[PDB]
């Protein structure tokens, strides 16, 4: 290339496009949503309601821990009896898009996601630096933030160029 | 790109590491924890899988076959594309995702041929490159099929350099259509 590019950027570029703008332009047509309820073995929705969306667009709130290493856990602990897995089928895919929701009786508060993808990041440092330059006065600590950070702009960036209205907040834990 | 904080990579690394880690080795990682496969036989008219076809998966495991067209500007269109009768969709729930993975099969009656995705994380690799380069600059001398080459040669090289870093299955072929 001619441009220095950071590994998060294209992984930015990829969540924005095949994930959230997905998401989004599957609410601004289907205006609904697949809630899950009970679920056979083999991880099969059985009991499936039907929640319709509204213009008062619940917020995606992406959240990301500082310890990206921590990422593929932090998947299968935020999952709890208070939250429930959400699906929708857009014509983008053929397999839908599965996003976490709190539900308060029946009222979705907020739809989460923890960026699987922000781990590739994380591995790719790893790969890129030795292990002795890593352990080194902090250095792999300040390359993870950098990755966040730059992968929390480029969504920024992307959704200025868009000109889209913000649909989604960015937290890190 | 090192010594320093000045490290530049090309856009299609970081996807190929998060396709390998994130895709490719979950499936094997299902594959090798006795996960077996659910064939979609029968949908209703939302796309919800009425009849599904538990399938066993025996150590000569199937090929996962990465399949890329060369007009990477029109991946998101061929994904919808291969999504025919002569195919079918099979799902696998593996213990890392709350989520189950979603591929397509080729089936000879009741056997498994093969298991082939097209890499949608690659796309982004065309996105990231539409959005660092002038139109000027991208129309001047092929200078973007160039660029799309590169980035589909990178994606099948960091693979490859992955595998190589942990275990050759060579779980997977590569081909550019
Ligand atoms: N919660 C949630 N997040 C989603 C969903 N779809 C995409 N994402 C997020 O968006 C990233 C980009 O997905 P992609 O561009 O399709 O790029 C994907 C895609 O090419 C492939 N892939 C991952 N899972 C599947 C799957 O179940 N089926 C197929 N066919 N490909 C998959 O691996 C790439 C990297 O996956 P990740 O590292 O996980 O990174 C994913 C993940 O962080 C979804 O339905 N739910």
Redesign the pocket.
């Known amino acids: 290339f001619n441009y220095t590019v950071l590994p998060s950027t294209s992984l930015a570029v990829?969540?924005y496009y095949?994930?959230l703008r997905e998401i989004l332009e599957a609410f601004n047509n289907q205006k609904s949503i697949q809630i899950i309820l009970e679920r056979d073995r083999t991880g099969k929705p059985t009991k499936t309601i039907d929640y319709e969306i509204k213009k008062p667009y619940p917020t995606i709130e992406i959240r990301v821990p500082q310890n990206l290493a921590s990422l593929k856990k932090e998947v299968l602990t935020w999952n709890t009896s208070e939250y429930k897995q959400i699906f929708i089928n857009a014509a983008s895919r053929t397999?839908?898009?599965?996003?976490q929701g709190e539900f308060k009786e029946d009222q979705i508060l907020s739809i989460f996601?923890i960026?699987?993808?922000l781990?590739?990041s994380y591995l790719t440092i790893k790969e890129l630096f030795t292990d002795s330059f890593l352990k080194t006065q902090n250095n792999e600590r300040k390359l993870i933030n950098k990755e966040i950070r730059n992968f929390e702009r480029t969504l920024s960036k992307l959704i200025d160029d868009t000109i889209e209205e913000k649909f989604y907040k960015f937290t890190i834990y």
Request: hydrophobic share 35%.
């Open positions: 990829g969540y095949n994930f397999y839908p898009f599965f996003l996601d960026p699987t993808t781990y590739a």
